[PDB]
Design a protein around this ligand. Structure first.
Ligand SMILES: CN1CCC(c2noc(-c3ccc(O)cc3)n2)CC1
Length: 338
């Protein structure tokens, strides 16, 4: 096991699930918080927080590939096409929603929003009359459009672009009646952990099957995002460091799923292809997954430069509470008696 990291078992069309599991396991600040969840009273079959702790503990200690059968059962995606019908951000939403709820009233409460929550302003500004509506919204990831864009920069430029509201799509200004208006979105804050979903998988009207766009789309190792802030901080620039590259190889519905990571944030990359984990070049993790063949990234994880050390803080064996280790060791001991 030259890498020091252990892989995950392939047990059905779980698809990206193993890529997401490794991506979250190496969000060290999240892993430590998951261990701390008060789970001793949970039922080892229905509880999703406990199943997530099991996978993370096995990923941290086992020399052999880690199984995920109890995880898949815990949140109930068990039909033939259950993972084909959803995408990675829904799975990530199902998981993170459960652990943040599990952290209520506990010492790691608010860890999910601290890591992933950003602040955003959506607006509608009337062009002929003085009226404006701003709604501040939270976001936990960003869906980036890639069709027609060459890189992450053009995808952000398109994200904050202004939309015209005229013709049939005039704005209902209420007292002012129908009005021509401008609609857009501004970024207030960017989170410590940036999850960017690249919109390569979409449905084409009038549809039957979902289509995957394999156009070339580039992303940098370092991503400066001060430009897209309404107001910047001299002591905390929005400089982001590429951490994970979730990759798909194959055609529209069918394909292989792999994740690349430099878990320490030191630019030393590894390929997490299911159970096999191996060192790879930086070029293979980033440049080779631009596309333009059928292998390319569909989700990216960036960590803010000033937050790298805390998000990726060290995780030892003593960061797992004793009651947790006793229960899982009891579980491994029970199954070993067959
Ligand atoms: C209610 N509260 C906030 C909403 C929801 C949530 N929290 O984070 C995410 C999320 C989704 C996709 C990602 O790629 C990363 C994060 N979803 C559940 C927790």
């Amino acid at each position: 096991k030259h890498t020091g990291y252990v892989g995950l078992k392939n047990q059905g069309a779980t698809c990206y699930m193993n890529s997401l599991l490794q991506t979250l396991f190496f969000t060290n600040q999240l892993r430590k918080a998951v261990y701390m969840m008060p789970t001793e009273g949970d039922d080892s079959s229905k509880s999703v927080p406990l199943a997530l702790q099991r996978v993370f503990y096995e990923l941290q200690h086992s020399d052999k590939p880690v199984g995920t059968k109890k995880l898949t059962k815990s949140f109930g995606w068990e039909t033939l096409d259950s993972f084909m019908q959803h995408d990675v951000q829904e799975l990530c939403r199902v998981l993170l929603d459960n652990v943040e709820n599990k952290m209520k009233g506990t010492c790691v409460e608010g860890t999910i929003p601290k890591l992933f929550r950003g602040k955003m302003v959506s607006y509608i500004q009337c062009k002929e009359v003085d009226y404006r509506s701003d709604r501040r919204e939270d976001y936990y990831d960003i869906q980036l459009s890639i069709k027609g864009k060459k890189n992450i920069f053009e995808s952000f430029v398109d994200y904050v672009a202004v939309e015209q509201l005229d013709g049939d799509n005039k704005y209902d200004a209420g007292e002012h009646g129908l009005q021509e208006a401008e609609k857009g979105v501004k970024f207030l804050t960017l989170p410590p952990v940036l999850h960017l979903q690249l919109m390569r998988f979409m449905y084409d009207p009038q549809t039957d099957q979902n289509i995957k766009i394999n156009d070339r789309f580039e992303f940098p190792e370092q991503l400066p995002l001060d430009e897209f802030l309404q107001k910047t901080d001299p002591k905390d620039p929005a400089n982001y460091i590429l951490h994970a590259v979730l990759v798909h190889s194959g055609d529209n519905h069918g394909g292989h799923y792999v994740v690349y990571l430099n878990p320490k944030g030191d630019g030393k990359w590894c390929k997490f292809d299911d159970d096999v984990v191996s060192r790879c070049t930086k070029e293979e993790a980033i440049e080779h997954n631009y596309g333009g063949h059928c292998t390319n990234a569909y989700m990216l994880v960036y960590i803010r430069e000033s937050k790298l050390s805390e998000v990726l803080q060290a995780v030892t064996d003593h960061d797992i509470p004793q009651q947790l280790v006793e229960r899982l060791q009891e579980e491994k001991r029970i199954e070993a008696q067959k």
